[PDB]
């Protein structure tokens, strides 16, 4: 059972591009280790990324949007903490 | 009920880019109307797109990869064939 | 020794930015080494045209739509390699 | 400057920065559309990540401390234009 990642993003805030980019950054790094990445259109300024239900990022709490390094690290810390990302 | 869309794509075939693009084309067109689009890393030359489990594209069956028009129309046809897409 | 410059002109209104950006990435993934740049150029009514140093390798009307990634990479390969 | 801005994103190809460069290109073009002349994606070497407008640097990896978020990227472009 490989982990499942969800990205909930506000459609009218035009956050689809950044959500899709982040999905592709995740899949490029963790291709063989994750089951899927789900892009979930949402409303009202929501931007949230979960790994099997655990929030690794949420816009209000985390103060914006993640850079690729910090996103990969937070996913790694949950699914494969021993992996060196460089 | 808002459908779940899944795109299964072969990781080692370098098909992430096209899978991600199609996900974006789908979400851009059907924003509200779609529950989610899942990108599902797969192996062995698989490229398959399903709408709530119903196959709307598969590489071997359909002879390659879909253009954005045919992709959008196939999804529309499955969710409400009477819905106009302008376009 | 100067590297080819590829341009993708696309209709802004037709929402063709997504497919243009995707093609730019398919091109740079495959020919990273051999090309100098890929330029995305927002353009007017119904245009979708790809050029390699001015040479047209795809136009929407004349080629009957939009290219699949194999026939895009092959047409570039033929011109640059 | 009286021509439409030419934007260029030079990115390290061996670092797998194509994804993030193509993404920023799309963010820029989605926001500014035909107010931009072009966004050029330029395969580079050696950890380079540089964004210019008509040749003026508005972002560089080592002096700006990494990679821009969409909000700041767009504003720096807006500032010049």
């Amino acid at each position: 059972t490989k982990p499942r990642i969800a990205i909930r993003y506000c459609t009218q805030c035009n956050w689809l591009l950044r959500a899709g980019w982040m999905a592709q950054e995740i899949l490029q790094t963790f291709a063989s280790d994750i089951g899927e990445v789900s892009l979930i259109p949402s409303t009202g300024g929501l931007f949230e990324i979960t790994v099997d239900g655990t929030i690794i990022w949420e816009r209000k709490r985390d103060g914006g949007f993640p850079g690729p390094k910090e996103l990969k690290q937070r996913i790694r810390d949950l699914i494969d903490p021993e992996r060196d990302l460089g």
Side-chain angles (χ1 to χ4, degrees), chain A:
Chain A
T1 304
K2 298 191 191 159
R4 279 142 27 111
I5 300 187
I7 306 180
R8 286 169 174 90
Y9 70 95
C10 182
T11 67
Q12 294 293 118
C13 300
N14 296 298
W15 294 342
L16 173 60
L17 266 41
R18 75 191 63 186
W21 164 56
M22 280 173 211
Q24 285 178 95
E25 288 283 353
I26 292 166
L27 291 163
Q28 194 160 253
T29 299
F30 299 103
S32 68
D33 293 304
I34 65 108
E36 56 169 30
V37 176
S38 297
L39 291 162
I40 306 173
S42 310
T43 56
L46 185 56
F47 195 93
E48 172 197 281
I49 305 181
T50 54
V51 181
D52 297 316
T54 311
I55 296 154
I56 61 161
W57 193 275
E58 187 286 317
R59 183 184 57 93
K60 296 187 306 303
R61 169 189 87 90
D62 293 297
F65 303 84
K69 189 48 158 87
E70 70 185 330
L71 180 53
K72 289 164 192 189
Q73 287 180 321
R74 286 178 184 229
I75 289 155
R76 176 272 308 284
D77 284 354
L78 252 55
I79 75 170
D80 193 5
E82 298 191 11
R83 175 177 176 188
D84 192 354
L85 287 181

